[PDB]
Symmetry: D2
C-alpha cells in the first residue's frame, strides 16, 4: 500500500490498496445518525458522517480508508509483525479494536490536532471483528487539509509521528523509512553536471539522467522513496481537475501491476484500487485495476441511520467512437 | 518514449509518447485510395489502409505511430544524435524521407518479413517536411502479431535487429540496450533466498523484495529495463479486455509524470499519450496525460481517398454517480 | 572507520582508522603498574596490561583501539552527533571520560560479559583531555575470542547490543546498520540463475555477477554492508598466518584511498592504518597508508612503552 | 583482471591477476640475446630486453604481463568468448600466436604508435603452446609513459582503441565499458547538495555520501567503473614512492578476496598478484595474495633469469 497527501488548489489524501485479491470493496457512506457500536466502549448515536472504501459485514462499515464531513482522512496500511494489539483493557484509556479505529477518530475529530489528542488516550485491543475476519497488523495515516500524522502501535506503545512529506507505505517503522530517504539526496529532476571526474568526457544521450539511483521495485521501502520523489517534484496544477489528474499519476508511479510481485500463495499482489479524496470538497475519486475511468462520489453531510453503498464497476469503461 | 508488444488473447503493439508539449495529436485513418506522394519516389495510388496517431499538415498524414489493415505496426521514437539521414541519393535504393517511412512500409507490407525486405533496400534522406516541421532523429519498432524488429539508421548504415522482447525506448543503440539487461538476471518476482550469507539472519518484513535493483528513474535505459521486467512478467489475462487493461498498466510503469524530468530550458517531459493497438482486430486504444478513460477507434473497410481524423480530447472524463 | 572480528584458527579483532590527517599514531604498551589517573574517579595503580595504537600526550596513552593481557579488545570509532557525554556527575555510577573509557574497561575486565556489567554502570562525562585534543563523538566495538558487543552512549542512554556479525563502522545507530543488511539478501558469491524472466536469454560474459547490488562507495552504511559481505563469505584460513592475511584483505575491501572522499574542509579522508589483533596470542599486527609490510608487536611495569609507525614504504629490493 | 596506467612523478602500468589458482608465477627477465622462436614467423636473435611476470615452460617466457627496456608495457587480460583467433595463415600479415604476442610487440616496439603499426599488420593464429597450456581468450592493454591503447581481436577483426582513462578489465568490449561510465556522471568525491527536493530536510550523518551508486562487486563492469573512479580522483603523490603507494591502493579498490566470487567448479577467484611497473625507471614492484610486502626488480645474455614469487606473509617482527 501507498498513502499520500497533496496540497494544491484544493487539498488531497488517498492511497493505493495493494493486495493479492479484492475483498468486495465498495464505497460506503456512514451518515451522522448511523449508531457506531464498540466492543468495550459506549455507543455513539450522533457523529460526523464518513465516506470511504471498505466492506459491510453484519451492517458494520469496515473501512480501508475514509474521510469525514470536515475533511479529516484516515487510511489503514499493512504493518505485518510490527503492529501490536493489547490483550489487556486499560482503565483510563479508550479500549478500541483496529476495525473501530477509523470510526473512533473520524466520527469524533475535525482535524489532525483533535485526532492526535484522541490517539494519545487510546489502547488498541486484540479483538477480531469475527472468527471469519481475524485482525491484520496495520499502521495509519491521518491527514487534514494542512498536515498529516502516522500512528504506529508496536510492542513499545502508541507512536505518533508528524509526517513532513505526506507519504506512507508498509514496513519498516516510520523513522526507518524517513532515515532511508537520506541516501537519495543526490537524485535530481534535471541532468547532473559531471562530478564523477572532469578527466573523462562523460556524455548524456537522453533526458532523465538526474533520476539514476531511484529504485523501481515494489518493495515498501522502494515505493516510499519513489512516491516521495514523484510527489515532492510533481508540477502544480492550475485547477482542481489538474490536481486530481496529477494525484493519479503520482499513485501510478508506485502502482503494482499483476505479475511483478508474487506472494507465497502463488497469487500476484497488485494495486486493487487507487483513490483521491478532495478534503475541501469532501469528494472521493477512485480507479480500479480493471477500470481506468475515474469515478466520483460526494459526501452530503444528508442525515440517516442506514449505511449507503455504491459497488465498484470492475469492467474497463471505454469511450468507443 | 517507450514502445512495447504483447502476446495474449489477441496481439498488441503500442507506445508512450514522452514530450514537453502536445502537437494537438489525433487519430488519422488513411484509406486505401488516399494517394501517397513521395519527394523522390513514384506516388502510390492504391495501398493498405492505416489507422494511427499524429498530425495532418498540407493534407499529408504525419504519423507518430500507426498500424495497417493487415495488423502490421510501426512507431517512430526519439533517437537524438544516433539517427543519420543521408545527404546522398542511392541509385539501387528507395530514397524515402523519415516522414514518408511509415507510409512506405505500412502502405506496402503485410508482415515484419516484408517490412525487412523494403528496409534492406531503403535510403532515408535528409529532406524535411517543411520549415515549421524539421527532421528530428528517430529509430523505429516494426511489429506484427508474431514478432518485431528495430530499425536504426546511423552513420554506419541501416541496422535491422530482431527484437526478442518487444521493447524499445530512446538512446542508446539496440545492442547496448539488450546487453544492459544482462546485469539484472538476479531480479525476481518472488521473495529470494538469503544467498548473502547463512551466517546472518536476514529478515523480510514486506513483499516485492525480489525486484530490489530494478531502476525506477525515467532515463531511456532505466525505462528499457523496467518496461522489459514489467512486460515479460505480466500475468496472462483470459480476455482481450484484460489484455488491453494489462497493456496500459505495463506502459504506466514507465510513464513520465509532469515535474520529474526537466530539460536545460526548463521544459517538463511528460507522457503526452499512451496507446494500444489490437493488431488482430485493427483497433486503436489510447489515453492522454489529461484523460485516464480509454478511447477506442476501429479501422473499418474503405472507397475514400480523404483522411478521416478524430482529435484527442485533453479533459478528465470522470464518471459522476 | 571500520572495525571487524574474525573467528578462525585463533580469534582476531581489528580496524581501519579513516581520517583526513595523521596524529603521529604509534604502538603503546601500558604496563600493569603504569598508574591510570581519572578526572572524576580514584586512580588504578595495578591493572591488566594493554597493547594498542594511539598517541601519548602528557605521559597519557590516548588509545584509538587496544587489547589487554586477557585478549579483551576495544576500539573507538567516529559516531558524530549521536554520541552523548554528560555535563553532570552521578553518585550511583562510574564517571569516566571518553579518552578514559578504553583504560577503564580493558584495565579491569578480562571478557565481554565483565565489560558489559561495567559499561551498564558507566556515566561518560563531557571533559576534554586538553584545549588542543577536544572530544570527538565515538561509539565502541568490545570483542573477546568468543563474541562482541557494540556500545552507543546517546541521548536515550547507554545502549549495549550483541554484535552477531562482528562488524562496526560509523553512523547510523546499530539497529539501523543491521536492518540495512536485509535489502541485500539476494546478493550471492555465485553466478545467479536468470530469475528476471525465462522469456529472455540473458548472457553471463564474466565472473562475479552474483555480487551486483553490493555498494562500492566509502560511505559508512556502504562500508558496513561491504565489510559484512566480504567477512562472512571470506574463505577459512588453514593456519593463523592465513587468517591474518585474510583479515587484511577483508579490511582492504572497505579501505579509503586518498582522493575519493573530500571533506567539508577540502581534506582527503583516508585509511591512516589497518590493524589485526590476535586475541588468543595477544599480538598486534598493523599496516599504514604509507607502508604495505605487516608489522607485529607482542604484549609480554611503570612507564609507557612506545614504537613509532614507519611512514616509508618498506620494499624488498632483489637485484 | 584489472590493468591501469598512472601519470605522476614517473609513469606507471600494472594489473591485478584474478584467477581461482596460482600457476607458480615468477619474475622473468628475457635478455636482448634470448632467441625468440615463433610458430609461423622468422626467429628474433637480437631484440629489446623485457621484465615481467609469467611462467617458463619449454624454456619459453609465457608472460601474463611485461615491459621492455624502453618502458613500453603490455598485459593480457581474460576476454572469454569475445577473442577470435584465426584458423588460416595470411601472407600479407605476421602470423603470431596469442602467447607470442607480448614478445612480438615488446621485442620490437619503443612506444605506443610503433606497437599500433605492428598490431595493424597482425594475424593472431589459433595455435596452442602445448596440450597442457591451451589457448584462452585474451584482450590487451599496451601503455607507454604518454598513453595506452586496447587491442581486442574479435570475429569482426583487429580493433585498436585509444584508452583515454588508462583502465581495462574483461568483458564487455571496450566501447561498451566506456559507454557504461556515462550513467555514473552524478557520483562525487564530496557530500552532494540535496537536489532530491527543496521540500524535505535530508540529513548527512557521515562522509562519502558523494560516492553512493558506485558499484562494489567484482564483476568486470563494476571493477571497470570503480577502478576508473578511484584512479581519476586519486590524489597526486609528491614522490615516485608515494605514486607507487597510490598505485597499489588503486589496484586494491578492485582486488578480489577469496570467498566472494565462486566460479562454475566451486573454485574461489582471487587477486593472485598485483604489480606496478615504473616505466621511466623500468622497475617491477609486485605483491601476492599471500604476501603484502612489495617486492621490486629493475631491468638492467641468452638465458631466461627468473625469481619465484613468495606466497608467505613477510612480517616485520619488532
Ligand atoms: C518529438 C517526438 C519524440 C519525443 C521526444 O523528443 N522525446 C523527448 C525526450 S524523452 O522522450 O523524455 O526521452 C517525435 C516522435 C514522432 C515525431 C513526429 C512524427 O515523426 C511525424 C512528423 C515527421 C516530420 O519529419 C517532423 C514533424 C513530425 C510531426 C514529428 C515531430 C516530432 O519529431 C515527433 C512528435
Ligand atoms: C489480508 C490483508 C493483509 C495481507 C498482508 O499480510 N499483507 C502483506 C503486505 S506487506 O508484507 O506489507 O508488503 C489485510 C490488510 C487489510 C485487511 C482488511 C482491512 O483491515 C479492513 C477490514 C478490517 C476487519 O478487521 C477485518 C476485515 C477487513 C476487510 C480486513 C481483511 C484483511 O485482514 C485485510 C485485507
Ligand atoms: C587465466 C588468466 C586470466 C584470468 C581469468 O581467467 N579470470 C577470469 C575473469 S572473467 O572470467 O573474464 O571475468 C590468463 C591471463 C594470462 C594467461 C596466461 C598467459 O597469457 C601466458 C600463457 C599463454 C598461453 O597461450 C596459454 C597459457 C598461459 C600460461 C596463460 C594462462 C591463462 O590463460 C592466463 C593466466
Ligand atoms: C577523528 C577520529 C574519527 C573521525 C573520522 O574521520 N571518521 C570518519 C567517518 S564519518 O565522519 O563518521 O563518516 C577519532 C577516532 C579515535 C579518536 C582519538 C582517540 O579517542 C584518542 C584521543 C581521545 C581524546 O578524547 C581526543 C583526541 C584523540 C587523539 C582522539 C581524536 C579523534 O577523536 C579520533 C582520532
Amino acid at each position: 500500500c501507498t498513502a499520500i497527501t497533496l496540497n494544491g488548489n484544493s487539498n488531497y489524501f488517498g492511497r493505493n490498496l495493494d493486495l493479492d485479491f479484492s475483498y468486495g470493496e465498495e464505497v460506503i457512506i456512514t451518515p451522522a445518525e448511523y449508531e457506531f457500536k464498540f466492543r468495550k466502549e459506549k455507543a455513539i448515536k450522533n457523529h460526523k458522517s464518513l465516506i470511504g472504501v471498505g466492506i459491510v459485514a453484519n451492517d458494520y462499515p469496515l473501512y480501508f480508508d475514509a474521510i469525514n464531513e470536515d475533511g479529516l482522512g484516515m487510511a489503514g496500511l499493512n504493518f505485518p509483525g510490527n503492529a501490536y494489539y493489547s490483550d489487556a483493557l486499560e482503565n483510563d484509556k479508550d479500549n478500541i479494536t483496529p476495525f473501530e479505529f477509523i470510526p473512533w477518530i473520524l466520527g469524533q475529530c475535525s482535524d489532525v490536532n483533535e485526532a492526535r489528542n484522541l490517539v494519545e488516550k487510546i489502547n488498541l485491543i486484540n479483538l477480531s471483528f469475527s472468527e471469519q475476519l481475524p485482525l491484520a497488523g496495520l499502521h495509519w495515516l491521518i491527514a487534514d487539509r494542512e498536515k498529516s500524522i502516522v500512528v504506529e502501535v508496536t510492542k513499545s506503545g502508541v507512536h505518533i509521528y508528524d509526517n513532513p512529506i505526506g507519504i506512507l507505505t508498509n514496513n519498516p517503522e516510520f523513522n526507518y523509512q524517513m532515515y532511508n530517504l537520506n541516501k537519495y539526496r543526490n537524485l535530481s529532476i534535471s541532468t547532473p553536471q559531471n562530478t564523477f571526474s572532469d578527466s573523462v568526457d562523460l556524455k548524456v544521450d537522453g533526458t532523465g539522467f538526474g533520476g539514476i539511483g531511484l529504485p523501481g521495485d515494489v518493495s515498501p521501502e522502494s515505493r516510499f522513496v519513489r512516491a516521495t520523489f514523484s510527489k515532492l517534484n510533481s508540477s502544480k496544477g492550475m485547477t482542481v481537475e489538474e490536481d486530481i489528474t496529477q494525484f493519479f499519476h503520482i499513485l501510478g508511479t508506485v502502482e503494482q501491476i499483476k505479475g511483478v510481485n508474487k506472494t507465497e500463495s502463488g497469487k500476484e499482489e497488485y494495486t486493487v484500487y487507487s483513490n483521491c479524496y478532495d478534503l475541501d470538497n469532501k469528494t472521493l475519486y477512485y480507479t480500479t485495476y480493471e477500470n481506468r475511468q475515474i469515478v466520483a462520489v460526494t459526501l452530503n453531510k444528508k442525515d440517516g441511520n442506514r449505511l449507503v453503498t455504491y459497488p465498484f464497476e470492475r469492467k474497463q469503461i471505454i469511450n468507443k467512437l
